[PDB]
Amino acid sequence: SNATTDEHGLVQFSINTTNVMGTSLTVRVNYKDRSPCYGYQWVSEEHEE
Amino acid sequence: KPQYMVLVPSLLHTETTEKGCVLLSYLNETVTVSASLESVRGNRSLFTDLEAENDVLHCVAFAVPKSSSNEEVMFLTVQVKGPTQEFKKRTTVMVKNEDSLVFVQTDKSIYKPGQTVKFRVVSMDENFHPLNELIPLVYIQDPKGNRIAQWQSFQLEGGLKQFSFPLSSEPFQGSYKVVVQKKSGGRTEHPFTVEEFVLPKFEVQVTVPKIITILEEEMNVSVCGLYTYGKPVPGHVTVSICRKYSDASDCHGEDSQAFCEKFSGQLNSHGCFYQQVKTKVFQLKRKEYEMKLHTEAQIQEEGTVVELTGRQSSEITRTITKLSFVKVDSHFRQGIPFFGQVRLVDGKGVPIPNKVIFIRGNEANYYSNATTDEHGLVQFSINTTNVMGTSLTVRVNYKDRSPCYGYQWVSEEHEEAHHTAYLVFSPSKSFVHLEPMSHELPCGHTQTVQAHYILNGGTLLGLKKLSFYYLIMAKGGIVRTGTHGLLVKQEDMKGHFSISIPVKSDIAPVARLLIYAVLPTGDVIGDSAKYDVENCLANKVDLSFSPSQSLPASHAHLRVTAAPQSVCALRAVDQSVLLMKPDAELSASSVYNLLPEKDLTGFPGPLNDQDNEDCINRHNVYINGITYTPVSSTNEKDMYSFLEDMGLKAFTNSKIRKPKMCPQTETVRKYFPETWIWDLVVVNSAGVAEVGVTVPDTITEWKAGAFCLSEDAGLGISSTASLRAFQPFFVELTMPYSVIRGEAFTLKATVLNYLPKCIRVSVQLEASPAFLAVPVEKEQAPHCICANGRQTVSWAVTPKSLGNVNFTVSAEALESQELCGTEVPSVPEHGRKDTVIKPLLVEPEGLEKETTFNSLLCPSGGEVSEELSLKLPPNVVEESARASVSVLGDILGSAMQNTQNLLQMPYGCGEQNMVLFAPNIYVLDYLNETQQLTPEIKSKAIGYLNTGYQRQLNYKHYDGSYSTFGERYGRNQGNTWLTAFVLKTFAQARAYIFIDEAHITQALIWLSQRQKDNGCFRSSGSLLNNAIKGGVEDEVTLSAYITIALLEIPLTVTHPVVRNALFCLESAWKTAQEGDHGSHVYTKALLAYAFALAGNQDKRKEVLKSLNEEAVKKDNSVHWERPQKPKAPVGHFYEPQAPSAEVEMTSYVLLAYLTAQPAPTSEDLTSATNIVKWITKQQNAQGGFSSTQDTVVALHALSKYGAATFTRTGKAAQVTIQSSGTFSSKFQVDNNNRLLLQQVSLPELPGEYSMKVTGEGCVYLQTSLKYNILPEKE
Ligand SMILES: *[C@@H]1O[C@H](CO)[C@@H](O[C@@H]2O[C@H](CO)[C@@H](O[C@@H]3O[C@H](CO)[C@@H](O)[C@H](O)[C@@H]3O)[C@H](O)[C@H]2NC(C)=O)[C@H](O)[C@H]1NC(C)=O
Ligand SMILES: *[C@@H]1O[C@H](CO)[C@@H](O[C@@H]2O[C@H](CO)[C@@H](O)[C@H](O)[C@H]2NC(C)=O)[C@H](O)[C@H]1NC(C)=O
Ligand SMILES: *[C@@H]1O[C@H](CO)[C@@H](O[C@@H]2O[C@H](CO)[C@@H](O)[C@H](O)[C@H]2NC(C)=O)[C@H](O)[C@H]1NC(C)=O
Ligand SMILES: *[C@@H]1O[C@H](CO)[C@@H](O[C@@H]2O[C@H](CO)[C@@H](O)[C@H](O)[C@H]2NC(C)=O)[C@H](O)[C@H]1NC(C)=O
Ligand SMILES: *[C@@H]1O[C@H](CO)[C@@H](O)[C@H](O)[C@H]1NC(C)=O
């Protein structure tokens, strides 16, 4: 689910509990996929999630 | 002891006179030698009887008969027939039909539209002589790839033929190329560019060090600008220099350049601008190699900015210090201390004297120093007393210095010279050495080589005269032969003897020379060496001009000395078009590289291996004496090795091989400039003088060259002789290529005075109705300008009329006294007034727009016709509209290149083997439908086909499936896609090579076991990569593949598996059509062919209409592409799941269009022809396509189109085109010119045309209408 950053760049939310034990939660933003040519090669400027 | 010997080259060219020599050495009786060449299989047989006297080297040549196979291996057996004794020996030789070396010269490197292109083609043999060959075709390929003109089946008259093609008024700006396909196929290509430009009057002479040392503070650099007789021009230069670091990544910007020391200044008259730049700003480390040096000489009194990116060849070498050998023996003996010379170099080929060196010998322990003599050099010799292999290294000055951390820095390198010489196997401890002289030998100048000899028990019979023989070889064949008769007393201690050798030119760049003795003990002793010969021609030709300078003079002689009788091709062109794009290198060195078999060293090893006769090596594995020693391999040199290195084998009696074998006119007017003289002449007994009338647009120097062909002295090439031409008082004008009709522009006129006296002058521009000149400066007062002076006058000209406009402009030296200058000698002799008439064309105003009308018209053995009405909007500018039509049988473009690279050797697991086997079916399929096929390839293919089938069968299961790994353990479950794929290709495969039907039925059954009514097919197993499939692993995309593969296997639509698969695909479309959230295209294109193939012509058109609407049209090339807006997949599968999703799904659609049950309609196939135009263009350079599952469907879709279009028996195809108003034009398309774009213009303002086609075979009719509309509301 998407949302927008409120004043002071922030977003609170909750989710429904009905699955197995270990629950992985990642949050991606703006542009996760982009083309900085190769990964390792000569220069990396990753945008941390 | 009775001895004989016959030497022959291991590669004998067919239908070329191939020399082979014979030596019979000891008498007994009169004997007859005889070589007989005969086929490995079949009844082909020959015999050449050779004469032979005692103790002599008689030679003989012979032409060999042709073989249908490009290269065939045959048996050659020599036989000595004599009353007393009879000897014979066999070996395999390779014959080959080595085709001619041909080339094309063009009048220019570049062309302007409408101008006629002139070229000339020529053919020679391995001796550079005119060869009157029959060339089956030549043709001009445009930048888009369409063959625009061609000349079929013709013979070269004097070893050459001149041609001409007029370029269109509206051609395609870009690079073209003329191509000559020999009888064998060998396409000799040659390019040229076509574009609109305005030629340059001046060069920009950039001077930069060619290779510069790393360790540097600064460097000298300079830039000048001249044109005729070296008269420089003044201008505000803006030079730059920026280096590009070694980056293996781009990312949008892609500008590898970094440090930028730009500069600025003015050029001095009678000179240039000079500058020294500090190199420490560049910090030449961390991957730094090349660097461009741009220029910008902006000439004053001209808005002309002519740059020149010169010396983009300035370099920075890691080997800042260096050593190398010069003259060292690579073959030696323990009984003669060997000699070897070395030379010192410092980065840029600089020899440094008086600097200590350190020689190091890892054998005789020769660790001795010396100092470099004048020209940085040191010769020396060492003592021979060790086991065979000797390693000899030499390390200098800073042998070991500065072992810096090379991770994040430049390894401050220093080269080192080393060599490993081996000793020869001595039979009777006697031998022969050849003194080496490696360095470029000049031809037309004799050389003499020194030969050393040693007899330590060599005598044995004790005869007076011992014959020594020698041979020289080049171009893969023996050229010259001779002998020398050394005579000896008793046990000849030593001695020195030399043999002469004229450097003639009949010897190519390599000159392999051997020498060898014939002892009665039954031994051979000799040596062989290589000498680099300079690349030179035999017909010595030289070009010159009787006059020089002058102005638009008449009769200027042009003289060519050459062979007594020779045809000589001349070429003279302004050195402005030559300045523009340099002409394609045509020198002696250009021709020598064109020669096949520059050198023959070693037998033809990859295809043939004549390397066996007897293994007596392992017979003995006994004892030495003091402690048992079992035998093992060696690395010594023998006589065989020297003959092998030569590239000729030998049939012989005497001991040649080592033991082991088991181990492996107009007053004052100017015009006419492009190409002055393109012609040819015949040389009388000496030379020949051509009286060329001089050109008038002689603002620059006329550079001109030539070449000759003679039956005796081969071919020759002249030294480009120039001719200036400079009127002291002249006028030039700065102006563009084209201009727009309505919009005004700025014309300039620049007058010059290189005459010593000073003159005042007026500027006349004679107006005409076609334009309106408005001077920028109103006063037309004459202004003084003295020696090396100039004045410019800008006029604001607006063209009225359209087309070509010929301007007029005059300038006269006014004698008006009461002058600004300290003197008034304005009146010169007769140069006093010069009038220039230089035209430039004009285009129509507004915004241009174009329409296109393609239509495949196929008369099925009768006639078809279509009507073309060309409308025009009311806003078209008058005469701005124009149009033309084209005709052809196109699919023979990709079909040239692609065919070659594909069909590979099968290997790998179940996944990999299919990638190599699967294409091999569809290529064989496509090659057959196009008609272009060969039995030498069909056989080579079937081998990679039958093998891959049996190899694939190795990864099957008992249940009929096929897994990525297979079953070495069998801990797998076959993947549903791989099985389905196997089956689709085993259905195809089954047509050429016969397949076991059980494997398909076994698979088919297993596919039905993993079939669910709803959702049709289910995913089964794992995959190493998703590269083998455009399938989006969705049940819809998978079932969409299994359903095609199942229908492609001839199966009825009433089948229970297909009935429950088709049910699923109607539900898949009806929902994938309804809800845009779900599918998008890969699926849409698969659902198309599946329906078409199944027979729902109604549902087919239902999906095909919403597909066609969702398509991506372009330049008459319609196709499809994955819409890139949603997301971008993984960094490994980002390029196949989109570009290959594009280039497979398109060819999937194509099949759906082609696949109509009665037959595809004219409306289906004409739309299909457009899709062919894109896929055929979007082709992989080497051959094939991006992924593998696209390469396969592309070829299957092409071949299936190719079946519908082409005709075998339909030779004739007629095409007429008329208009309501008396227009008429016809053409003829047939079996040979289907591969040619036959074009014609159309004259009507309101088009009302009729296309009529007749006979058999298809024709593609593309009509393009172009115009220019001017509406605007701003
Ligand atoms: C592969 O290429 C071969 C040719 O090398 C193709 O075979 C040719 O196909 C046509 C029909 O498409 C044949 O014409 C018919 O021949 C019979 C006699 O067998 C005759 O009674 C009919 O009136 C008609 O003329 C043609 O003879 C046949 N053979 C040759 C040598 O041209 C084949 O279609 C191609 N395709 C595949 C997948 O093999
Ligand atoms: C964030 O989530 C919401 C709700 O899931 C998405 O909202 C829909 O957006 C479309 C236009 O893109 C509207 O037509 C609908 O009215 C919206 N509502 C629903 C419930 O579908 C929204 O698109 C998402 N944001 C982004 C950036 O995709
Ligand atoms: C260089 O070669 C000569 C060959 O003539 C060597 O001379 C022999 O040396 C041995 C001793 O090692 C003597 O027994 C022989 O009688 C010498 N022969 C002659 C003809 O003088 C010489 O020793 C070698 N020197 C080096 C340094 O390699
Ligand atoms: C512009 O004027 C020149 C010079 O008169 C024309 O060029 C040639 O003129 C001679 C005059 O004797 C003719 O014989 C040639 O046939 C002309 N050349 C060509 C290619 O036709 C030139 O034609 C004029 N341009 C226009 C568009 O009228
Ligand atoms: C889970 O809780 C959320 C609360 O935001 C609610 O919207 C959703 O309907 C609930 N679903 C289920 C399966 O309980």
Ligand SMILES: *[C@@H]1O[C@H](CO)[C@@H](O)[C@H](O)[C@H]1NC(C)=O
């Ligand atoms: C010829 O050669 C044979 C075989 O080596 C030998 O018998 C004979 O003596 C030789 N000489 C003469 C003079 O025949």
Ligand SMILES: *[C@@H]1O[C@H](CO)[C@@H](O)[C@H](O)[C@H]1NC(C)=O
């Ligand atoms: C072909 O073979 C026959 C024997 O079957 C033989 O008589 C003939 O010499 C051979 N032909 C040639 C050209 O050598």
Ligand SMILES: *[C@@H]1O[C@H](CO)[C@@H](O)[C@H](O)[C@H]1NC(C)=O
């Ligand atoms: C480079 O210029 C310097 C003067 O600045 C001069 O001494 C030197 O000889 C020039 N280099 C060459 C190789 O001419």
Ligand SMILES: *[C@@H]1O[C@H](CO)[C@@H](O)[C@H](O)[C@H]1NC(C)=O
């Ligand atoms: C070179 O060799 C000679 C003699 O062996 C010796 O005197 C000299 O010191 C050596 N040179 C160097 C640089 O050591």
